[PDB]
Amino acid sequence: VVGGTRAAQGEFPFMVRLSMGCGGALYAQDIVLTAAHCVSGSGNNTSITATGGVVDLQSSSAVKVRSTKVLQAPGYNGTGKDWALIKLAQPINQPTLKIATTTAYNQGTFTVAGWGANREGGSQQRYLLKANVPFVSDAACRSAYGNELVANEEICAGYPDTGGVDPCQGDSGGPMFRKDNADEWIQVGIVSWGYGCARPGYPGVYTEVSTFASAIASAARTL
Ligand SMILES: [Ca+2]
């Protein structure tokens, strides 16, 4: 995360770090919701590691669990539908993150977090970083990305005029969230892509969770 600050231990306990350099959220204690582009496809897979329970990846308190299977959004090909679920061999005993099923929260100021780079071309982070990024309308986002932006499948956030705060390489798959009307965090997005990181005129793009919530929920029941 470019322009982020250190998250406190226990602040966002649903966060998990994935071995390929992605973030993810605990949709269930043993099911990670991440980006489709973080995996190569669906199927049995025991080569992925999810590190949960800590902001400091070097902590002896970290829990490292291996995957058993991956379910990448059906039909994924790099043009939207950027979501995937990863079944874990053992559950990570931490709070889970509720996903948005309506579009009522696709507005306001969001929060993102990850161990990705804090500068373009930078190395990964040892400590979880968090940042607040305001919602950016489809129109403004489209003024930047044109046809690359998939209407209804992608939501944008950040500072369109001046940049400065934005997820970066290594943060993909992480959840973008905010408070619902019950003072509980709810997930409206999944870090997906952007041109560069934190650049004026180029906001961050995220998987619009509300659009795929029913699909994610059904797929998760099959894991
Ligand atoms: Ca949208």
From Swiss-Prot:
Keyword Protease among record annotations: yes
Active site positions: H37, D82, S172
One of the GO biological process terms: proteolysis
Reactions listed under catalytic activity: Preferential cleavage: Arg-|-Xaa, Lys-|-Xaa
EC number: 3.4.21.4
Keyword Electron transport carried by entry: no
Molecular function GO labels: serine-type endopeptidase activity
Keyword list, A-Z: Disulfide bond, Hydrolase, Protease, Serine protease, Signal, Zymogen
Top EC category: hydrolase
Cysteine disulfide links: C22-C38, C141-C156, C168-C197
Residue ranges of domain Peptidase S1 in the record: 1-216
Site feature location: Required for specificity: D166
Regions crossing the membrane: none
Stated family: Belongs to the peptidase S1 family.
Protein name, entry field: Trypsin
Originating species: Streptomyces griseus
Encoding gene (name): sprT
Full-length numbering of the shown residues: 37 to 252 of 259
